[PDB]
């Protein structure tokens, strides 16, 4: 299908045409692909690599194996920002995720997303004051296991109290967070 | 919603039966039943009668011992394993033969490769699963 120089000059790069003259000169009329099987040498896609694509192709002026330049006439002065930022729009946002007392801030947010209680009330109009912070334990056969029972009373000093318990085997504060939860969850108006 | 095997220019069927480590290549042909294992007589090559009996067995399950000339060529392994690989190949080249009766051929099991091979030396036992002595007191 060796085309004519004129049309070849109308669809491909310029000073890379002599190569295409030598391309049509040697290659024959073979139409049998007769591939060597799973060559995996050719790219998964195609459109002629005439144009260098950032990230997909190596940085044009960068020291990398196969630089094919020279250890002198490089062109990478300053190295702060990633040399190749992601292509296309930019985010790999797994389709389905949105670009992402403070302990209390979470305690509330979770319940807001769950129970419906208003976040602001929990973070600014309540006070969690721990009451009993012990360390119970269970005689598992895999070794005496310990834990952190915690009763953290949280209430708005206006007319709403709730006693919440809690428990963890990792950290006492972790159980306190859980306990803030069980209490903001169990708020009850005190006549 | 949502290759066929045939005989050669000389009209013979060749199959590579495989076992232990042998690749018994075997040329089976329609001439009167004589054997040649590895360029010499059958009794000269396989001294143990069992090996010979095993080799015969594919021709014995069919009533065709005496019908088919067999030219076996073995390599690798020992004698019994070689004989078994030869037998197998006969079943693989019989693939080209008795097409319908090949059902019985794969049945008797003459077309079932024997994975039965040599286990590796477990990085701790004397051989493979031969544990060395274990003490106590």
């Amino acid at each position: 299908q060796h085309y004519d120089e004129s049309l070849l000059s109308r669809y491909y790069p310029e000073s890379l045409l002599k190569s295409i003259k030598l391309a049509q000169q040697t290659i024959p009329e073979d139409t049998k692909f007769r591939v060597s099987r799973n060559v995996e040498f050719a790219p998964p896609y195609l459109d002629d690599f005439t144009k260098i694509h950032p990230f997909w192709d190596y940085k044009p002026g960068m020291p990398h194996l196969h630089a094919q330049e020279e250890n002198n006439n490089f062109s990478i002065f300053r190295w702060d920002q990633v040399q190749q930022p992601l292509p296309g729009e930019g985010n790999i946002l797994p389709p389905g995720v949105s670009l992402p007392k403070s302990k209390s801030a979470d305690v509330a947010a979770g319940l807001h997303k769950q129970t419906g209680v208003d976040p602001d009330y929990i973070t600014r109009k309540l006070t969690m004051k721990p009451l009993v912070m012990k360390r119970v334990s269970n005689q598992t056969g895999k070794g005496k296991i310990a834990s952190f029972y915690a009763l953290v009373v949280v209430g708005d000093k206006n007319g709403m109290v709730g006693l919440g318990e809690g428990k963890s085997r990792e950290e006492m504060s972790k159980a306190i967070f859980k306990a803030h939860w069980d209490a903001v969850r169990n708020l009850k108006e005190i006549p | 919603y949502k290759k066929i095997k045939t005989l050669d220019e000389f009209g013979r069927s060749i199959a590579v039966g495989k076992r232990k480590s042998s690749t018994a290549k075997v040329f089976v042909v329609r001439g009167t039943g004589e054997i040649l294992v590895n360029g010499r007589q059958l009794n000269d090559y396989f001294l143990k009668m069992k090996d010979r009996e095993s080799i015969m067995y594919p021709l014995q399950v069919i009533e065709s011992v005496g019908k088919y000339n067999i030219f076996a060529t073995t390599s690798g392994g020992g004698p019994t394993g070689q004989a078994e690989s030869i037998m197998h190949a006969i079943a693989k080249a019989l693939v080209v033969f008795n097409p319908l009766l090949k059902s019985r051929l794969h049945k008797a099991g003459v077309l079932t490769r024997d994975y039965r091979h040599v286990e590796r030396k477990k990085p701790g036992k004397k051989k493979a699963r031969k544990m060395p002595t274990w003490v106590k007191r």
């Binding site: 299908q1 060796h2 085309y3 070849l8 669809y11 491909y12 190569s19 295409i20 030598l22 391309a23 049509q24 040697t26 290659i27 024959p28 073979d30 692909f33 007769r34 591939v35 060597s36 060559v39 995996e40 040498f41 050719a42 790219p43 195609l46 002629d48 194996l65 196969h66 094919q68 | 990085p123 701790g124």
Partner: protein, 134 residues
């Protein structure tokens, strides 16, 4: 629609080979790596390099692999009743160069080098012929 100017599609297609008019060998290319990937890949570029270099090359004849092995104890002290085996397969590929000329074959070797891969080693025994005395 814009087609695939030979060279372009040639990469997609299998490496084009050539004829051996007199069956006269000149060199060999036993590329060896501990990894099959670059080997077969680099090899294709070599097979390709030659077609354009007009040097009837053969196939990357797959010579056998070398299973170097070493067993050691898996602990820092005593505890030898338990051990581990380690291995380093050395892959090998042969690209014999057939009918050619004494000079051109320098390029294939020279050019194939200036764009080498990572982990692939090349050895090139050259088989020359002359008279029976100089």
């Amino acid at each position: 629609t814009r087609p695939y100017p030979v060279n372009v599609e040639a990469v997609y297609y299998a490496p084009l080979k050539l004829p051996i008019k007199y069956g006269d060998l000149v060199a060999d290319i036993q590329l060896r790596s501990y990894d099959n990937e670059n080997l077969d890949f680099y090899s294709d570029f070599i097979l390709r390099t030659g077609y354009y270099l007009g040097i009837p090359l053969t196939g990357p004849k797959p010579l056998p692999t070398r299973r170097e092995r070493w067993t050691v104890i898996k602990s820092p002290f005593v505890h030898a009743k338990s051990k581990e085996n380690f291995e380093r397969h050395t892959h090998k590929r042969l690209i014999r160069a057939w009918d050619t000329n004494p000079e051109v074959l320098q390029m294939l070797i020279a050019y194939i080098t200036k764009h080498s891969m990572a982990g692939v080693g090349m050895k090139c025994n050259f088989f020359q012929r002359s008279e029976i005395s100089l």
